[PDB]
Design a protein around this ligand. Structure first.
Ligand SMILES: *[C@@H]1O[C@H](CO)[C@@H](O)[C@H](O)[C@H]1NC(C)=O
Ligand SMILES: *[C@@H]1O[C@H](CO)[C@@H](O)[C@H](O)[C@H]1NC(C)=O
Ligand SMILES: *[C@@H]1O[C@H](CO)[C@@H](O)[C@H](O)[C@H]1NC(C)=O
Lengths: 157, 52
């Protein structure tokens, strides 16, 4: 967090819908970038997989409710997000509309994920509206496991 | 008989190549039939090399 975005502020991406201990906060594996000194310049970021395992990467895209918030937060009207790798490619554009409140919020955030194979690289490019990755996972596979749904208590068995 | 038709759409890596090969910036491809309809737009981005 403290060395990847010299331009852009990293300390103001909090909301009341994700409040913790009575104070506004945000997710802990993702980062909300904002304008610094009245500008939101283009960004480019690459990561090369050198962990000899698959890596799970997650990101998000923000859709505000009116053009005033878009102009005040990103200083742009036609923003784009591009995410590419060796066998993955996608482009995203924000949509501005008025929506019913869910947790007191009229905007939305869409969440995306991908798996990166060993020795591969992934590239992020953005004009605005990007919720950047902060933490990823290197996965190990096994046999005889799953997810079950229950309300039983834990015992010393 | 039924006929199988195949086509493709090219996505270059920089805007200079787009301008040099097609002399346009906002291109489109449209394919339609009686029960089929689609539109395609190229996307310009820098990507890792696969076969160079
Ligand atoms: C941040 O801005 C400086 C301008 O002094 C620029 O040199 C640098 O490349 C920018 N950061 C990135 C990641 O490009
Ligand atoms: C940021 O991206 C836009 C879009 O291509 C480009 O025109 C502009 O030159 C970029 N910024 C800089 C400082 O080059
Ligand atoms: C656990 O859920 C089952 C059905 O979902 C219910 O019958 C049972 O009362 C629940 N147990 C407790 C301790 O709430």
């Amino acid at each position: 967090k403290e060395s990847s975005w010299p331009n852009h502020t990293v300390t103001k991406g909090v909301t009341a819908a994700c409040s913790h201990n009575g104070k506004s906060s945000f997710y802990k594996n993702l980062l909300w970038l904002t304008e610094k000194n009245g500008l939101y310049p283009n960004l480019s970021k690459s990561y090369v997989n050198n962990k000899e395992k698959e890596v799970l990467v997650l990101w998000g895209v923000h859709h505000p409710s009116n053009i005033g918030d878009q102009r005040a937060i990103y200083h742009t009207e036609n923003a784009y997000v591009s995410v590419v790798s060796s066998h993955y490619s996608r482009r995203f554009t924000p949509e501005i509309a008025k929506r019913p409140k869910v947790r007191g919020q009229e905007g939305r955030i869409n969440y995306y994920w991908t798996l990166l194979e060993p020795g591969d690289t992934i590239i992020f490019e953005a004009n605005g509206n990007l919720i950047a990755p902060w933490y990823a996972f290197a996965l190990s596979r096994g046999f005889g496991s799953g997810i079950i749904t229950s309300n039983a208590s834990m015992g010393e068995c």
